[PDB]
Structure 1
Amino acid sequence: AAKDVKFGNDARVKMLRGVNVLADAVKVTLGPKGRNVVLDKSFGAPTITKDGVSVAREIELEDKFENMGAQMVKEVASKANDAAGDGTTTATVLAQAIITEGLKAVAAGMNPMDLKRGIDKAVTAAVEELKALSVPCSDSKAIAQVGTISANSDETVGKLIAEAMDKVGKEGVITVEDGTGLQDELDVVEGMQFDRGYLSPYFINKPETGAVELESPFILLADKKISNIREMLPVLEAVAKAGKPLLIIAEDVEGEALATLVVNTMRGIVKVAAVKAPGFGDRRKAMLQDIATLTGGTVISEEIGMELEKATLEDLGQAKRVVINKDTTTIIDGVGEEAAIQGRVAQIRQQIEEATSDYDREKLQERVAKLAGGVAVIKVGAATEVEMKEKKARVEDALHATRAAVEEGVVAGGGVALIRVASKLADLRGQNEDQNVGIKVALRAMEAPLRQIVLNCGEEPSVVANTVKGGDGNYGYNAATEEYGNMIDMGILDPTKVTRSALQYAASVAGLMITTECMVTDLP
């Protein structure tokens, strides 16, 4: 309704103070000597986190102007997280430095939009230099290293991730869940396994109790429910009874089919089992074809001139063995030739890139893996729930970080990257003096991350930053050992993707934020 407006430097100060609250809150978590922030939650017990964007998201201020500022820089940490998954704190520190020096330049009466232009040019150039310094991260050693770094110097996490990426490969899927016991644990499921259980509990064939085993069985795949009665199916069972046991996959299996199926499996004339198909309906309908081509069987598609009632023993798929429990169904191997199969693993790759980003990629690469690779799950150990949350957060951080490292390569850590490219951009100049100042502002702000890392140790940022600028190559400061040295040799690695993204995102919002000559909001 009724508004309140402020103009010029008067508004810039309020906005800046607002930025500074969010930034000062996020800064303490930066680097190895960084400390932890506690975020209250109304419903439960509090959460303790070193994760930057988690802290940033929770910040909101009275005094609506300061709040506007904070709400604006919150976006840099949020997009940093949503793109890379690590380095949010760094992106925030960069944003703060840029806003500060930038507004300082505006106070000098320099043209703000021109400052923005200079900054953005400086950033594009710096991004080129970054993409240049990057060296591929391939061998499991380096991977374990960047893993350890994103995890705040927990070696176990890095080595565990290196192992997982080693077993299921890069293309393979890796997920992380809460662990029961205190030790971190890595579970790896190979081959075709999907998450659904047996419809009838009577099917257990083994002293394994819940589990069910079928040796070299035949697999039947149906698009439609058997939900009516057992009428249509038995013609297939008659051919299936000749030499083999049988596995069923469909939409669902109702009583009339199930009970009779049970009675026949009990004596049993032939051993049979039935489970729901893996996913939600359409995706799952797509996954039935996966199971089909994998087992060398054919899907029965109601919407074609193949009828559910008529099917022959050759229509069935074959497998070495199959195992079912309350949770998942498993095929121990496909009997179909790898030419056609790998044809389908390759052809699904055209489906891999799409407007759905990672939503499709998790379960699609899941699909690809289940056919070719494997799926992995990391159970994070902790004593208490408050340790559990933070620990798992660092783990997911390390996972994102390693994926980024693998994808875009890595550059020297400890914030030595940005300062190193900044030294290469010293001769860069713009169209006018204002733009020159903008560039110089950006180049100054790229020192921020390192100075903050040093500062969290309670040491001179000026001195360390200088003695680093005195050096060449990967020479940098090791904050944990509080000594200088070669970063790459010390195994301190920043994934290029996260440094690149953090810088890009910081400059994007700070650039716009320093062009503010007016602010409009609701009344207090």
Structure 2
Amino acid sequence: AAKDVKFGADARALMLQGVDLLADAVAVTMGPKGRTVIIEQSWGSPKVTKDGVTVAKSIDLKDKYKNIGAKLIQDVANNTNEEAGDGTTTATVLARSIAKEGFEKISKGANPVEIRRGVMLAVDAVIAELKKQSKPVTTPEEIAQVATISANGDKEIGNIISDAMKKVGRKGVITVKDGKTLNDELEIIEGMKFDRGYISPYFINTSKGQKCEFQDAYVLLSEKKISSIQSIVPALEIANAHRKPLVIIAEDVDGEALSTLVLNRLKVGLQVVAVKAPGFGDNRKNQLKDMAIATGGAVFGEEGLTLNLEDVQPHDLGKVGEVIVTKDDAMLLKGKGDKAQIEKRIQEIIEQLDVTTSEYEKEKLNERLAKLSDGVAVLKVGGTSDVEVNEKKDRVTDALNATRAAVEEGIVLGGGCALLRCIPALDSLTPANEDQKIGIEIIKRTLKIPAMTIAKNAGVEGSLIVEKIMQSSSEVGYDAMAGDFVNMVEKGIIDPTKVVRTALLDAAGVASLLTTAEVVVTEIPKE
């Protein structure tokens, strides 16, 4: 394949043109006053979206040289989306700013590698300052405010998320599905999440979602590994006799048993799924007992009152109404166990919580209580047509991800003012030479970009707004939706720290490497 080679400023200009095009397309959706982007779909209706990485991933350019910058910005946005789940537009605009400054600061005597090192040093200092200034979340009002801010100022989504996390706890399970009505509905379904996926992908019974879903499934628990075929055949016979699916939760399944299960499922049609038993040692036995009590079943392989898998009986297996299994996790939703046994187990765990003072035991008992009690939550998004339902689902997912991020770590000022207050942290750095000084100055100039973009999207002059923000007190910022300078914390314009630091880190790490190029090699287009 013949190739074309470009040298010097021409390649930089072409790649900067590509980066500018992609970032200008992306940045129109930033802020409370941003607008949407319509993307043509080949198989049906066009998709209307406000999500930054969704816009970034859908732009490919005919030119070979601009496509390089487009792909690099796409990489920035995708990394930011995967690591944090939010703040892709901020990463895109920061990447464009850093790339433009780096391209403009290249001369014959300049050393781009030392500029990259200085940029990395400044970014590390800013991240340290951000972590120092962070504060934790303690009240449900903060959760509601975070959810509302992340959902483009929709208060109903924030209230729904806050109520869901009240009902299922701060570490509960929340799932988003498309609805069939005009309003949003929240349903609380009992269940557990034991952080174990399926052993073999042959158990998948659907083509969409890549999950194994069974209804009214039998529960099979074994403390020890399943090796003998005769220890599992009667269970399969019982499951087939009742025409009900079977769920196998043991320590491990060897090759012979797994092959037999796969062959029976593919040929006969038995709905059998085997997963790894969660926990280790004592915790594994405790959690097996927990599911046995919850589903009304029993634990096989235990030393005390040992019950063998060979003489398995229908009454020795628990019943679960619905099972959902994926490659990362699996859930059993509604068991059929007696309430008395569940109450006894809960009381025993509560008593054991007050017996010993240790992090490990207390955390394990709290996890067991949460699994046995909280359950899962499902959110249904309503609307009239598919496009608006999809857009609302995107906003709800972004709000959920941002709320989880703000629960894991602390929160900072929103509206782009968090990065502005970290500029004085760059005054404590001592560059080793001129190039590190150039990099530090590039980062210092770049740190003002998010606030300027948010102000510009609102129809005002960003420079004056940023200058006024920097001259006010530490708690005063700009309210773009209202157009007034207000107390950010009191008005509830707050953002997670994780999203901000992740976006800054990814943008800097990719753009600084991009700005060190001298030669670009691309393939000649074919006919």
> What is the TM-score when the length of structure 1 is the normalising length?
0.77
Structure 1 position 325, deviation (Å) = 7.8
Structure 1 position 113, deviation (Å) = 0.9
Structure 1 position 172, deviation (Å) = 1.4
1:258 maps to which of 224, 236, 242:
242
Q: How many Å separate the matches in 2 of 1:178 and 1:73?
A: 31
Task: Sort the Cα spacing of 1:252 and 1:105 in 2 relative to 1 into closer, same or farther, 3 A.
Answer: farther
Q: How many Å separate the matches in 2 of 1:222 and 1:32?
A: 51
* Structure 1 gap segments, 5+ residues each: 200-218, 233-249, 260-273, 351-364
- Which residue pairs with 1:91 in the alignment? 91
Contact 1:196–1:329 (Cα < 8 Å) also in 2: no
- Which residue pairs with 1:508 in the alignment? 509
Aligned 1:158-169 pairs, distance under 5 A:
158-169=158-169
Tell me the amino acid that sits aligned with residue 33 of structure 2: K
Q: How many Å separate the matches in 1 of 2:52 and 2:484?
A: 26
Aligned 1:473-484 pairs, distance under 5 A:
473-484=474-485
Structure 1 position 349, deviation (Å) = 7.3
- Which residue pairs with 2:345 in the alignment? 337
Matched, 1:282 2:300: no
Matched, 1:26 2:26: yes
Structure 1 position 164, deviation (Å) = 1.2
Task: Sort the Cα spacing of 1:368 and 1:104 in 2 relative to 1 into closer, same or farther, 3 A.
Answer: farther
Aligned length: 452
Tell me the amino acid that sits aligned with residue 36 of structure 1: T
Aligned 1:108-507 pairs, distance under 5 A:
109-190=109-190, 196-198=214-216, 221=220, 253-255=238-240, 257-258=241-242, 276-277=246-247, 280-283=273-276, 290-292=290-292, 294=294, 298-300=298-300, 306-308=307-309, 310=311, 324=321, 329-331=334-336, 333=339, 334=342, 336-338=344-346, 369-507=370-508
Task: Sort the Cα spacing of 1:109 and 1:146 in 2 relative to 1 into closer, same or farther, 3 A.
Answer: farther
Query: Residue 427 of structure 2: SS of its match in structure 1?
Result: coil
Contact 1:172–1:375 (Cα < 8 Å) also in 2: yes
Q: How many Å separate the matches in 1 of 2:192 and 2:474?
A: 47
Based on CA coordinates, which of the two structures has the bigger radius of gyration? 1
- Deviation string 1:223-260 (CA, Å, 9 cap, x unpaired) is 69xx99xx97xxxxxxxxxxxxxxxxx667455x338x
Q: How many Å separate the matches in 1 of 2:236 and 2:388?
A: 41
Tell me the amino acid that sits aligned with residue 90 of structure 1: T
Task: Sort the Cα spacing of 1:521 and 1:222 in 2 relative to 1 into closer, same or farther, 3 A.
Answer: same
- Deviation string 1:307-366 (CA, Å, 9 cap, x unpaired) is 3454799x9589xxx88589964336425524776889977978xxxxxxxxxxxxxx8x
Contact 2:219–2:320 (Cα < 8 Å) also in 1: no
Tell me the amino acid that sits aligned with residue 445 of structure 2: R
Query: Residue 459 of structure 2: SS of its match in structure 1?
Result: coil
- Deviation string 1:445-484 (CA, Å, 9 cap, x unpaired) is 0100110000112211110010011112121111000111
Tell me the amino acid that sits aligned with residue 16 of structure 1: L
Query: Residue 128 of structure 2: SS of its match in structure 1?
Result: helix
- Which residue pairs with 1:14 in the alignment? 14
Q: How many Å separate the matches in 1 of 2:193 and 2:403?
A: 26
Query: Residue 181 of structure 1: SS of its match in structure 2?
Result: coil
Q: How many Å separate the matches in 1 of 2:277 and 2:181?
A: 34
- Deviation string 1:251-293 (CA, Å, 9 cap, x unpaired) is 67455x338xxxxxxxxxxxxxx65328841237988664225
Q: How many Å separate the matches in 1 of 2:69 and 2:362?
A: 45
Query: Residue 17 of structure 1: SS of its match in structure 2?
Result: helix
- Deviation string 1:14-47 (CA, Å, 9 cap, x unpaired) is 1111111111111001010111111111112111
Q: How many Å separate the matches in 2 of 1:454 and 1:277?
A: 55
Contact 2:297–2:317 (Cα < 8 Å) also in 1: yes
Aligned 1:45-124 pairs, distance under 5 A:
45-107=45-107, 109-124=109-124
Task: Sort the Cα spacing of 1:368 and 1:15 in 2 relative to 1 into closer, same or farther, 3 A.
Answer: farther
| Identity value in percent | 45
Structure 1 position 485, deviation (Å) = 1.4
Contact 1:77–1:89 (Cα < 8 Å) also in 2: yes
Structure 1 position 424, deviation (Å) = 3.1
Contact 1:149–1:493 (Cα < 8 Å) also in 2: yes
Of 287-296 and 183-192, more deviation after overlay is shown by: 287-296
Task: Sort the Cα spacing of 1:292 and 1:149 in 2 relative to 1 into closer, same or farther, 3 A.
Answer: same
Query: Residue 377 of structure 1: SS of its match in structure 2?
Result: strand
Structure 1 position 138, deviation (Å) = 2.4
Structure 1 position 370, deviation (Å) = 3.8
Contact 2:18–2:67 (Cα < 8 Å) also in 1: yes
Q: How many Å separate the matches in 1 of 2:523 and 2:151?
A: 42
- Which residue pairs with 1:268 in the alignment? none
Structure 1 position 150, deviation (Å) = 0.8
Task: Sort the Cα spacing of 1:330 and 1:189 in 2 relative to 1 into closer, same or farther, 3 A.
Answer: same
Task: Sort the Cα spacing of 1:51 and 1:325 in 2 relative to 1 into closer, same or farther, 3 A.
Answer: closer
Contact 1:415–1:450 (Cα < 8 Å) also in 2: yes
